[PDB]
Paper text:
The point centromere of budding yeast specifies assembly of the large kinetochore complex to mediate chromatid segregation. Kinetochores comprise the centromere-associated inner kinetochore (CCAN) complex and the microtubule-binding outer kinetochore KNL1-MIS12-NDC80 (KMN) network. The budding yeast inner kinetochore also contains the DNA binding centromere-binding factor 1 (CBF1) and CBF3 complexes. The inner kinetochore centromere-associated inner kinetochore (CCAN) complex (14 to 16 subunits) associates with the centromere, generally through specific recognition of CENP-ANuc.
We determined the cryo–electron microscopy structure of the yeast inner kinetochore assembled onto the centromere-specific centromere protein A nucleosomes (CENP-ANuc). In the inner kinetochore complex, CENP-ANuc is wrapped by only one turn of DNA (~90 bp), in a left-handed configuration. The two unwrapped DNA duplexes create binding sites for two asymmetrically arranged CCAN protomers, termed CCANTopo and CCANNon-topo, which bind CENP-ANuc through two different binding modes. These two modes of CCAN binding to centromeric DNA differ in the position of the CENP-HIKHead-TW module, constituting topological and nontopological DNA binding mechanisms (CCANTopo and CCANNon-topo). A second CCAN assembles onto the 3′ end of the DNA using a nontopological DNA binding mode identical to our previous CCAN:W601-CENP-ANuc structure, generating an asymmetric, dimeric CCAN inner kinetochore. CBF3Core interacts with CCANTopo and CCANNon-topo mainly through their CENP-I subunits. Specifically, the C terminus of CENP-I of CCANNon-topo forms contacts with the CEP3A subunit of CBF3Core, which are unique to CCANNon-topo and not a feature of the CCANTopo:CBF3 interaction. In the inner kinetochore complex, CBF3Core adopts the same architecture as seen for free CBF3Core, except that the Gal4-DNA binding domain of the CEP3A subunit shifts position to interact with the essential CCG motif of CDEIII, similar to the complex of CBF3Core with CEN3-CENP-ANuc. In our structure, the CENP-ANuc core is flanked on both sides by a CCAN protomer that engage the unwrapped ends of the nucleosome in an asymmetric arrangement, bridged by CBF3Core. This assembly comprises two copies of all CCAN and histone subunits and of the Cep3 subunit of CBF3Core, a stoichiometry that is in agreement with in vivo fluorescence microscopy–based assessments of the relative proportions of yeast inner kinetochore subunits, which are mainly found at approximately two to three copies per kinetochore.
Author numbering:
A (entry chain II): 148 to 268, 285 to 294
B (entry chain f), H (entry chain b): 25 to 103
C (entry chain d): 34 to 128
D (entry chain c): 17 to 113
E (entry chain e), I (entry chain a): 133 to 229
F (entry chain h): 35 to 131
G (entry chain g): 16 to 113
Write the structure that this text describes.
């Protein structure tokens, strides 16, 4: 359950840290998990799209790859529709003109779609360049 | 929600009708996406016709008119 | 109470009975045939109108209709169509 | 005695005349155009009905179906190319062999 | 053998002519899509024969696309229709794109 | 000394407002004329078709607005309808005042 | 008396469009507000395409607009490529691809 | 024959403007055949247009309208 | 290296805009084809701008077909466009067939 989470908050090459890569890869390489190789593959794939080519991350995935039917099931994240339907109504009622129900469902969907995409895939700023 | 509601045995039947014997995993949501695109393309013009007609219901005449405008003529529904 | 539906149903049924009486028609097939006939008529009429408007021709006549049907229908059916149409127009003029 | 009765065309003639006048296709309509168009329409309808009937003969059933209509249209290669863009409701698809 | 059962059901779906997608879910799908396009002042209304028409056109298009993907698969020496093959079919036919 | 209607000087003036100087070839001018004639024909045919569908003998600003919204993709269609609405409202207001 | 083209502030003509619609045999009656709307939308489209062609020529730093420039602009702009997918341009060439 | 007059270098040039690198020896005849078919269709349409026009000379207008009949509109001519 | 010269001339034909087929042979080809369609009572007459128009449309179609064949070649893991690839492109686009 935290595996889909870790995919989300880390969106930058900086968050793709080799010490984090070692922990994620070792868990998949660890025998007594039964779910880390499925969990690590998406996290490694998510870290791949962040830093770029990352030839070091594709050699780890091919070592921990599975039959990928479960990975297809692991790519899909099953969130309860009843849980989200009530949540959309609750958010709109508490805060009018805030957290719209259409976007709340949409925001969850694109977070879910990010997991599905893993299988397929004073600081100075010049006013001159501001557009 | 209901995009996954279109269940994979239906896509299996579509593939068998097409004539294939082997199925991958990506084609499922690829079919879902192409169906969504085709549906939105037809629905936009159907709603345009309905709103211009000042009626607030959608009819077979309107949908076949939209299909003929797209170029995929449909027969057997009148008009 | 309902404005009558303008169809070719009686004439299509009569044509079928002239051909052979044993079989019948289903409603879906009837709608399909009606739509096909309407589409063909619309195509031919639009083509004749456009062709007449091109040569600044104010009227539509047998020559224009024959050229339009030659444009639309492929030649194999077009030969028989123009032959039968010319026969019909000449015999109507004789009558 | 109707103009269709003289013409020998099952499809009516004055019907096509009034349809042509209503559709404002041209400023002035002719007189041989309705009979010519009616004759062409009758020929096409008779052709398609006869091919569907022959498909039914091969189908050994007294009831003809949009299934058989699609059979006739798609089996005739010329008719298929003429009607490539149309789709027949409940028509199915052709067998591979 | 799996091939025997597979080919038997290919036969039955080659001479089958019924809808393959569930009616209530498809109706809900088009329902919610056309509500998505709508302003908040009203809601649209739909009719059953329109639902059949849209579904019929949808699966005509889908069967065409899937048979073209099968042809691409035969071209690529693979009996499996895959992501790149479907992408290629969508691109080449290039409708509303 | 017979004048032939062609949008040549008008497109030249539009380019003059667009840029202080910009040359166009005769082929480019012919291409622009053909494009504008094609768009005008498409919009007029769509409006007439809508009027025939709705059993209306006349077409109007709403008819043309719906027609152009149909022809153009929605992104350009909203710009076009804004063009038409503000043009017609300012033209009508000028006549009243 | 000034023309209603000047009333509408449109360089493109309104009287010519009205005459074409009247003699085009499209509908039995032509609306009063139809020609101004049609002229406005036609002028907007023409102005947008002319602006794109001028930008392409400026990028190509020649003062002359050519069918090559027109084709380049049309194929580069998605909103215009959608409307002109099938039509081909004489002496337009092919957009350079990697 | 002038259909054979279409030279192999011309077909190589065409396939390369398309964007190919290597060309097999069987492509030239098929290119000639498809060009012949397209020409046959366009010429038949133009000829029937000018036969209705009761003129012994075809025109760029008629060629453009044959092209519009095929659905491939051509710009820069007529008007 | 052959690849260097090949890519250089690919560059020049990517920014080239001239006709590639000989004008007199192409004119003779269309000449003799349209005489083939003709009855023996007359001979047709043709014009140069019509010849350019037909040639321009012809090579638009040809370039489209050839680039689609190149895309099929990339699909089939072969840099060579071959007979089956060209057959497949012709079928899939399926114009006047």
């Amino acid at each position: 359950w935290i595996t889909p989470l870790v995919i989300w908050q880390a969106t930058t090459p900086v968050d793709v840290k080799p010490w984090k890569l070692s922990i994620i890869k070792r868990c998949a390489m660890h025998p007594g998990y039964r779910d880390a190789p499925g969990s690590a593959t998406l996290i490694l794939q998510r870290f791949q799209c962040l830093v770029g080519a990352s030839s070091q991350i594709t050699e780890s995935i091919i070592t921990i790859n599975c039959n990928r039917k479960t990975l297809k099931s692991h790519r899909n994240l099953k969130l309860d529709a009843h849980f989200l339907s009530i949540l959309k109504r609750i958010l709109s009622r508490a805060h009018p003109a805030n957290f719209p129900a259409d976007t709340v469902q949409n925001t969850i969907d694109m977070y879910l779609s990010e997991i599905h995409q893993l299988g397929a895939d004073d600081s100075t700023v010049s006013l001159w360049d501001v557009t | 929600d209901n995009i996954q509601g279109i269940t994979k045995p239906a896509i299996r039947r579509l593939a068998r009708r097409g004539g294939v014997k082997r199925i991958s995993g990506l084609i499922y949501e690829e079919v879902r996406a192409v169906l969504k695109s085709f549906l939105e393309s037809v629905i936009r013009d159907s709603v345009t016709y309905t709103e211009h007609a000042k009626r607030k219901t959608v009819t077979s005449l309107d949908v076949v008119y939209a299909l003929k405008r797209q170029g995929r003529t449909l027969y057997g529904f009148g008009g | 109470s309902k404005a009558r539906k303008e169809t070719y149903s009686s004439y299509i049924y009569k044509v079928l009975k002239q051909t052979h009486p044993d079989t019948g028609i289903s409603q879906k097939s009837m709608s399909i045939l009606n739509s096909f006939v309407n589409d063909i008529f619309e195509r031919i009429a639009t083509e004749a109108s456009k062709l007449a408007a091109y040569n600044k021709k104010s009227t539509i006549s047998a020559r224009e209709i024959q050229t339009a049907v030659r444009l639309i229908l492929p030649g194999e059916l077009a030969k028989h169509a123009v032959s039968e149409g010319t026969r019909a127009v000449t015999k109507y003029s004789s009558s | 005695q109707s103009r269709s009765a003289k013409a020998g065309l099952t499809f009516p003639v004055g019907r096509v005349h009034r349809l042509l006048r209503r559709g404002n296709y041209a400023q002035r309509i002719g007189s041989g155009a309705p009979v010519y168009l009616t004759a062409v329409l009758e020929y096409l309808a008779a052709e398609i009905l006869e091919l569907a009937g022959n498909a039914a003969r091969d189908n050994k059933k007294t009831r003809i179906i949009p299934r058989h209509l699609q059979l006739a249209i798609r089996n005739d290669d010329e008719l298929n190319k003429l009607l490539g863009n149309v789709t027949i409701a409940q028509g199915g698809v052709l067998p591979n062999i | 053998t799996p091939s025997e059962l597979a080919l038997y059901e290919i036969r039955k779906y080659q001479r089958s002519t019924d809808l393959l997608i569930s009616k209530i879910p498809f109706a809900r799908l088009v329902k919610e899509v056309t509500d998505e396009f709508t302003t908040k002042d009203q809601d649209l209304r739909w009719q059953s024969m329109a639902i059949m028409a849209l579904q019929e056109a949808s699966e005509a298009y889908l069967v065409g696309l899937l048979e073209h993907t099968n042809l691409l698969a035969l071209h690529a020496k693979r009996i499996t229709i895959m992501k790149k093959d479907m992408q290629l079919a969508r691109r080449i036919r290039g409708q509303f794109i």
